[PDB]
Amino acid sequence: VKLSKAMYLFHTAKDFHSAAQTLGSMKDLSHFGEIALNFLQIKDYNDLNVILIKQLDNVPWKSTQVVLSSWIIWNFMKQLNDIELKINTTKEDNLLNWNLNLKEKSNELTKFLESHLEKLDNETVYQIMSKQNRQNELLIFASLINDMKFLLSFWIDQGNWYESLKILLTINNHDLVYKYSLILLLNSPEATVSTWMKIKDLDPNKLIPTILKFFTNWQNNSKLITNISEYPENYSLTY
Amino acid sequence: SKFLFNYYLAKWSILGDFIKEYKDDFAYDKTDITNFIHIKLKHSFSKYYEKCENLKSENEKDDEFINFTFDEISKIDKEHILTLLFFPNELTNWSEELLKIYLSFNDFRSVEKYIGKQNLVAVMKQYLDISSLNYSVELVTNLLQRNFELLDDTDIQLKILETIPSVFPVQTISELLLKVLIKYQEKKEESNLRKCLLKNQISISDELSRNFDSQG
Amino acid sequence: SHMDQSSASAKDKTKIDIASFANDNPEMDLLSTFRAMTLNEEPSTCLKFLEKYGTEEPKLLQVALSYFVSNKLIFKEMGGNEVLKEKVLRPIIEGERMPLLDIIKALSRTNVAHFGLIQDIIIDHVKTEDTEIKRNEKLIESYDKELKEKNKKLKNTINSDLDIPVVFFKCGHIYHQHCLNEEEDTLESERKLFKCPKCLVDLETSNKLFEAQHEVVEKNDLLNFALNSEEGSRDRFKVITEFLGRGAISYS
Secondary structure, eight states: OOHHHHHIIIIIIITTTTTHHHHHHSSSOOOOHHHHHHHHHOHHHHHHHHHHHHHHTTTSSHHHHHHHHHHHHHHHHHHHHHHHHHHHOOOOHHHHHHHHHHHHHHHHHHHHHHHHHTTTTTHHHHHHHHOOOOOOHHHHHHTTTTTHHHHHHHHHHHEEEEEEEHHHHHHOOOOOHHHHHHHHHHHHHHHHHHHHHHHHOTTTTHHHHHHHHHHHHHHHHTTTTTSTTTTHHHHHHHH | OOOHHHHHHHHHOOOHHHHHHHOOOOOOOOOHHHHHHHHHHHOOOOHHHHHHHHHHHHSSSOHHHHHHHHHHHTTSSSSSHHHHOOOOOTTTTTOOOOHHHHHHHOOOOOOOOHHSSSOOOOHHHHHHHGSSSSSEEEEEEEHHHHHTOOOOOHHHHHHHHOOSSSSSSSHHHHHHHHHHHOOOOOOOHHHHHHHHHHHHHHHHHHHHHHHHOOOO | HHHHHHOOOOOOOOOHHHHSSSOOOOOOHHHHHHHHHHHHHSSSSSHHHHHHHOOTTTHHHHHHHTTTTSHHHHHHHHHTTTHIIIIIHHHHHTTTTHHHHHHHHHHTTSSSSOOHHHHHHHHHHHHHHHHHHHHHHHHHHHHHHHHHHHHHHHHHHHHHHHOOOOOOTTTOOOOOOOGTSSOOOOHHHHHHTSSSSOOSHHHHHHHHHHHHHHHHHHHHHHHHHHHTSSOOOSSSSHHHHHHHHHTTEEEE
């Protein structure tokens, strides 16, 4: 009867903000595809997400939950682009509030990710979100899961030297530094020397070839300078 | 009654200079054509029009008098410009027509007001005659971004992309190209998802038919 | 050796340099060192190095896409732009080096790139847009007919039809709803373990469901890994949807 009662609202009233919310109170659902097919033509992201979010409680035998989760992540991401396009379609304050609501939706997306983080974890969300740009959401997701492996590479590629140094300071592997310290030293030897000195747990045997390369580069720079010609060389020697 | 208004109506040299001065500026979001006309009038005549405007204000319901005044203004036209003073917002008193004057020199607001699915590539080609080193490119980008939802046809999109400038930095059009590519990818993904959902529904129907076959 | 190399100058040996890389295995590291040397002194020898060692240089080609276009003056010195269009851009496009959006962003990272390369990119984008439009039109044309046929078949099947109105179990059972079968309570047996209501317990342990779930999970993981490696290199899209179309929702 509850399903039949919501059918009349869906067919005529079409107020899915309340009808589907009332339809969301259903315990067990069987015609999910039939309901989704009608809702698909409506193209209402919020209504589709409301039914999908409740359906996520049906744990079943895992596995397929990721497939449902992938659509859930895409639906919110697709809604953000539609909202962003609508926000960019200006030709006001409520839209700015909607943009704030989009940030709240982004906060809701973070809240949705935080709640079921262990449920949905396949690294496919990173690939899914990469194609649509929006690096802020990717950075938030990377902050959510403590890996920092891709975060360090993203920071290095972007060029945030201070942020990259701060991230590397926390990392105690000492192997990534021993691998990629050359570029960091070339970019800013002054800060890199202090970071290496304070970091500790870094054998002087490592980066010996890197030290020689830095000395050669400093000499090449000094080939056409007089006063501060050996300044990078002075920093390397001091280190 | 209306005889005095006819006498008032009975009672175009610097207009060309003002139009040229306005056309000299090439700002994407400068003052509107009506705004520019009002600014020029303030710098400047309109007192007699204001006296007529006082009668016009009292003629908020005199439709016949409004039509007569519009006809008189048409017969008393000055460079086909001064009528805008008499009809600041009365273009329908006497749309496919303002572009002759509104879009003549420059009017971004009028361009958006009279924009449409068709007659879009011609407007871009006409605006491309600015011949500025980078101001023309900036104006074109602003015009494209302002009404980016207007272009929704594949043929129209291809035609618009074909006539892009060939001496412009890729950075200026990078945002537009990325947005177009993202929109196309999203449309393709939505079509694929709809096709997959239809296939799933067809599979469900086939399963129901197979169950019915099993049912006797 | 370092002192001798510093003293030595005006020596050109591309083949000898590759063989003199100590371990001579870190090709990517050698390419990065060559790029750093070009940053110190770029004499267009990067093109010669790429020509001499082009295998597995996809990452090297991607790096060179920005190394050779870092500076407008350097690009002009680097055979202007014809060489990049003929060799760099063409090979990268034909070898599926990366996504079109990634290449566009990499190009936009600079600020002094002429529109001739942007003109070639626009031609490629026009071709891609035509292909996408054709694919979308074909998909919509197929989908409309498929939906119409499916709706007609479902309507005919429903009109065609132990005959009381009831929903039969989709795993090999059927009963009349008015015969008290509907709303049997008992917590619905927790969806009856995703199976039809057997109305009896035969024991005999329970491992078929676990085996099926394990097989499904293994198949999904293997398909995803193989697609990311070979088929769905871009993303799980058009592959996750393909798996969904197989009937992962079940509801049987």
